[model samples]
Target: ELRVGLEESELWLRFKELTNEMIVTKNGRRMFPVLKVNVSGLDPNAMYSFLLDFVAADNHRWKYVNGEWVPGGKPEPQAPSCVYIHPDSPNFGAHWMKAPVSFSKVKLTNKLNGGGQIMLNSLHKYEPRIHIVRVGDPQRMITSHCFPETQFIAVTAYQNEEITALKIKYN
Candidate 1:
């Protein structure tokens, strides 16, 4: 059995309430307020791989006007979906449950292709998902979960003034 839970739910919701914005650059941008989670109820002897897969949260694109995100129109043709598998993957379940899992190193880029980077469109809304797969002789699939509160909009520039100010204030 596999059990998954969010680590910093309060922090994530705080960003969401303010309409979290993630900076996407031509090269890549490390996701701000990175996702962290906790896993439990795993077989102690089994090894598992933790991954974060980003996906479009809506079919429509958004534009910020007068401090609000309004429907701009349909989104551009989506790039192929991508996943950022944790670097310390295939670790024993004991190791995973020992500490909260973090995806602070996951990156977002506007590039159309890459080996490890997640492709995203600027000004698009997205949801970050978690997948836990049990690695065995046959590599069994375990489970996945999506956190709605972790949703955010991607932008090359800070479209929301509050987000920008919050970022500056925090930094």
Candidate 2:
């Protein structure tokens, strides 16, 4: 009996608290340590997508180099947007969200190489958002959630990753 509690309300409330904190320098922050999701009501025959998109804050583009928040370069004509396709798009919550469900280790980086350090501006702020997209199985394998299709259900604020956990529990 796998029960998935869609406690989206409780999750988002916590993220709001993190956003109100100050961001530090030369430090790394990880999200609340874990997003303990208990899921239920999933159709064994249905497939869905759990997407994570990291949107850079502010319309102006900035980079952290030389220990200062300098303009990284010219800003993108449009906001710099990218979708981390969960790598498990083919798998759904029924199979993917099993006990000890692992979305693997999610990494944040300036580059898309998947092995680079989190590229961040010295003083720039960032927010991480998670999305759980539902897709029909078998009949909808060819279609997918474009950036415009997903909803911003949860958003975490700009801060050091190391302090993220403490901030989540205490605050």
Candidate 3:
């Protein structure tokens, strides 16, 4: 009965409606409106761990010109990927079940090497995915979840004029 839900769906919705755009810099970028989720229906006695990782949405590289994302060219070879582990990992399910999980400190970067950064391309689309793993299990089967509404494009610069306008209007 394990279930995972995005906690700030309304906020994600507003961003998604405008085709969520995330700014990525050579140095790295932190996603504004960080991802938050809640897990439920876990065994009270069992322990769990949660992780978030980003993956390329498709094989195509995209460019923002003439007002929208379009095919640019072959994507740069992807850098090794990494996941952000919940700081409270390996705790009893009771602890995880208590609050909406927050990953406010996670950052995305284009750098090839890092101890904590999630590598991504400057002009590519990606999906942030969540995985829940049972602790103390030898097999360690994992339950994974992803929300389509959470999909966003990573860019070195604001590619869409409307997105820029929206950010200015909202902020």
Candidate number with greatest TM-score: 1
- Return whichever of 2 and 3 wins on lDDT: 3
User: Order of candidates by TM-score, top first?
Assistant: 1, 3, 2
Q: What's the best-to-worst order under lDDT?
A: 1, 3, 2
lDDT of 2 by residue, 78-170 (tens): 423555555567565567556533333454433334432234433334554555566754444332212211112121244335335755565
Which sections of candidate 3 miss by over 4 Å? Answer: 168-171
Which lDDT value does model 3 have at 8? 76
**How many Å off is the CA of 63 in candidate 2?**
13
C-alpha lDDT values of all predictions? 0.84, 0.43, 0.81
Q: How well is each residue in 1-171 modelled by candidate 1, as lDDT tens digits? A: 566888878877878888999998777788768788888898878788888888798888899988788999889888677888999897998989999999888889888555588899887899999988887646466587998988999898988888888777655
Best by lDDT: 1
Clash counts for the predictions, in order: 0, 12, 0
lDDT of 3 by residue, 1-171 (tens): 778888879877888887788887666677866788887898878998888899788788888767767889998887576888877887888888898888877788877555577888878889889888998789978988887778888877777777788777765
TM-score of predicted model 2? Answer: 0.43
Tell me the lDDT of candidate 2: 0.43
Those runs of model 2 whose alpha carbons end farther than 4 Å from true positions after fitting are: 1-32, 57-80, 96-104, 112-122, 132-171
- Every candidate's CA RMSD: 1.6, 8.1, 1.8
